[PDB]
Design a protein around this ligand. Sequence first.
Ligand code: HEM
Ligand SMILES: [Mg+2]
Length: 306
Amino acid sequence: EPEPQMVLSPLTSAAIFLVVTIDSGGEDTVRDLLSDVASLERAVGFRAQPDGRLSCVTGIGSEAWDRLFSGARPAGLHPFRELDGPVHRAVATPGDLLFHIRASRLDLCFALATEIMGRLRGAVTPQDEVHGFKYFDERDMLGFVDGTENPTGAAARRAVLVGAEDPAFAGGSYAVVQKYLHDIDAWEGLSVEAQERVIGRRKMTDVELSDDVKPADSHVALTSVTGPDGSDLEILRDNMPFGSVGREEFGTYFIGYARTPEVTETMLERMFLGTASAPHDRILDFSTAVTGSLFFTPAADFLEDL
Ligand code: HEM
Ligand SMILES: [Mg+2]
């Protein structure tokens, strides 16, 4: 059986997202680190178990894949597709490697990030570093509970893990990241009932709005997608708040895992380009994407065998 990376993590209250590019000539150093990342995760995390819940998911971008590896590629691995809507744009920004580091405490994330970046010094250039923290009641920076409809258990494994459709890459996943900044001043100008019509759920109690009050351009309406065969197309999210009070920077770091980028990209198209019923996702009137990258997160045994 292929052993996946810790894509399906228990709930964690802290994250570091590290996105780097590989410098010309840095390939050999990167390949050595990829074969050691699971060993480093154990070295940093074991002595803080069982409450540390430290994990690192490592992702490789399309262009980086072709620099690092020869032979067969994951079937759906391509650069993030830029979406140029009438009003809103999803930008593509550079990123060769993703380290999605999660734990119950920021210090465990930081210790592992330090070991990884120590091994990659001189081989990579940092593009993005975000220290994420969840609100004590799973709220995001818009004050809504965030994670509620994530798939769990068997449903989550079926939604996120590559299987027989791409058998050489079984146990992998596709991660799409986007750093969003929120216009909190504009958002806080709305009544709670208007905010609820933007999201599609009740703010305090997190109960979904009935189908007869839920707007067509609400977030939950546009990211609810069914396949030709009537099944829900699901992704696994672990959205993390971040920011800087002095710079008035209030953000949501979006990460969505799926067994094919097609599911995440269908949701992004509905959000950014809209549908018959909806010009675009109302969440984007208060949320600006400033990064956008796609990564393949290989099976753990793929990284071990380099
Ligand atoms: C802009 C920052 C984002 C924020 C603050 C945000 C926030 C939320 C919130 C509050 C919910 C409702 C509760 C729940 O998690 O089930 C939700 C649901 C969801 N979001 Fe977003 N989200 C963002 C971006 C995205 C993006 C970019 C995608 C997909 C590409 C996405 C996909 C989903 C999905 C699939 C659901 C569950 C819908 C359902 O089936 O009920 N989100 N999000
Ligand atoms: Mg402002």
